[PDB]
Amino acid sequence: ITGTSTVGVGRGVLGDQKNINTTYSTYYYLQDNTRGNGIFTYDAKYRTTLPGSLWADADNQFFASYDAPAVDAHYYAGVTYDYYKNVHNRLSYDGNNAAIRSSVHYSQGYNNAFWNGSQMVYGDGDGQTFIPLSGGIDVVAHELTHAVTDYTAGLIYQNESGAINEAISDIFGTLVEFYANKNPDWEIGEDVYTPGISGDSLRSMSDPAKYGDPDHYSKRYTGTQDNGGVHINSGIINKAAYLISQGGTHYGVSVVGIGRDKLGKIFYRALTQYLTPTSNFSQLRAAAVQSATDLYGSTSQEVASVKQAFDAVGVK
Ligand SMILES: CC[C@H](C)[C@H](N)C(=O)N[C@@H](CCCC[NH3+])C(=O)O
Ligand SMILES: [Ca+2]
Numbered sequence: 001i002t003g004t005s006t007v008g009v010g011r012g013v014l015g016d017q018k019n020i021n022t023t024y025s026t027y028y029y030l031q032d033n034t035r036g037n038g039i040f041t042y043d044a045k046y047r048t049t050l051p052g053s054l055w056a057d058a059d060n061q062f063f064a065s066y067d068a069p070a071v072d073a074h075y076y077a078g079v080t081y082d083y084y085k086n087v088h089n090r091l092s093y094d095g096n097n098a099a100i101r102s103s104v105h106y107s108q109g110y111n112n113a114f115w116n117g118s119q120m121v122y123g124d125g126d127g128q129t130f131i132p133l134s135g136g137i138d139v140v141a142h143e144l145t146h147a148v149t150d151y152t153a154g155l156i157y158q159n160e161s162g163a164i165n166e167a168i169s170d171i172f173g174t175l176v177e178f179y180a181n182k183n184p185d186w187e188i189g190e191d192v193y194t195p196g197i198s199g200d201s202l203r204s205m206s207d208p209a210k211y212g213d214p215d216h217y218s219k220r221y222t223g224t225q226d227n228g229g230v231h232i233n234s235g236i237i238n239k240a241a242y243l244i245s246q247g248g249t250h251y252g253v254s255v256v257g258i259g260r261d262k263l264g265k266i267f268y269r270a271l272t273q274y275l276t277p278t279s280n281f282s283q284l285r286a287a288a289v290q291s292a293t294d295l296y297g298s299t300s301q302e303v304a305s306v307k308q309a310f311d312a313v314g315v316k
C-alpha cells in the first residue's frame, strides 16, 4: 500500500517486545519499507486461501495474542533480509530486492511452515506439537532460504538434491539464528516445538541421530517417504556443516573447525556458483571444496577441513 513509514511495537510468540516497521494509510499495515521492495505480512485468518489480507491494525500496537505470530514473521523476515544483505551482499531472495511476503494463521492447528514458490506460510500449531511457527528465527530463516535456493542452485526437492536443499535451509536458518545472537544453537525449531517438553527440537545439526536422522552416508534413507527422505538425509549434510564450523571427531575421523563465518561463506559460494538442480552429495562435496579453494587456496586449512568433514560423514 502507499503510505508513510512508521514504527509499531508489539510482542512476539514467546512474549518478547520488539519494534516493527509498519506503513500508515488509515490503518497501520505490516509493511516494512526499509528493506528492499518491502516486507509484507498477511493474515490468512485460519483458512488456506493465500496470501490473505495485508495485516491491518488500528493503533500500531501489536500486543494481542492474535498479533504475536504476525509480529514475529514480520520481524524475523527483516533479520533474515539483514543477514543476507550484510553478510553475503545479497539483496532479498532473488538478489534484486524482491518483496518478501509471509502469511500467518494458516489453516487450523497446522503444525508446519513452508515456502510455496512465492511466499512464506506459517501454521499456528496445535499447541502440543508446535506453537505458532514464526516464533522460531531458525524456522523463518529456513523457509526464506528455500526462496534463495530456488532462485540460485534450484535443487530439486527429491532424493539427494532435496536433502541438500533442506540442509542448506537448516544451515542458513542456524547461521541467521547466530547472527541475531539470542541463545543461538545448532538445533532446529527448539523455540516453537513441544511447549510441554524442555530442551528438544525438531532436528539436530550437532547430533542428527538424537532424533533418528542419519549422520553418515552409510545410514542414508533410500525409500520413498518424505520425497525420498529430504528432511531425513539432510542430517548427513547438517553434520558435515556442523563439523566444518565446530570441528570434532566423528566415526574416528577428526575435523579441524574453521568457525561459522567461513562455513557460511563456503556454503553461500557453493549454493550460488557451483550447485545445480540435480546436484548429489558427491557433487556438493566437490562444490564446497572448489568454493573453499576459491576463497582460501587449494592447500588451506579451510579446504582440508571441508574434505575432513565430508570424509567423516561418508561422502566421497
Ligand atoms: C524448519 C522447520 C519447518 C517446520 C519445516 N517446514 C520442516 O522442516 N518441516 C518438516 C518437519 C515436520 C514439521 C512438523 N509436522 C516436514 O516434514 O515438513
Ligand atoms: Ca493494535
Ligand SMILES: [Ca+2]
Pocket: 138, 174, 177, 184, 185, 186, 187, 188, 189, 190
Ligand atoms: Ca535453533
Ligand SMILES: [Ca+2]
Pocket: 190, 193, 194, 195, 196, 197, 198, 199, 200, 201
Ligand atoms: Ca519443546
Ligand SMILES: [Zn+2]
Pocket: 142, 143, 146, 166, 169
Ligand atoms: Zn525446508
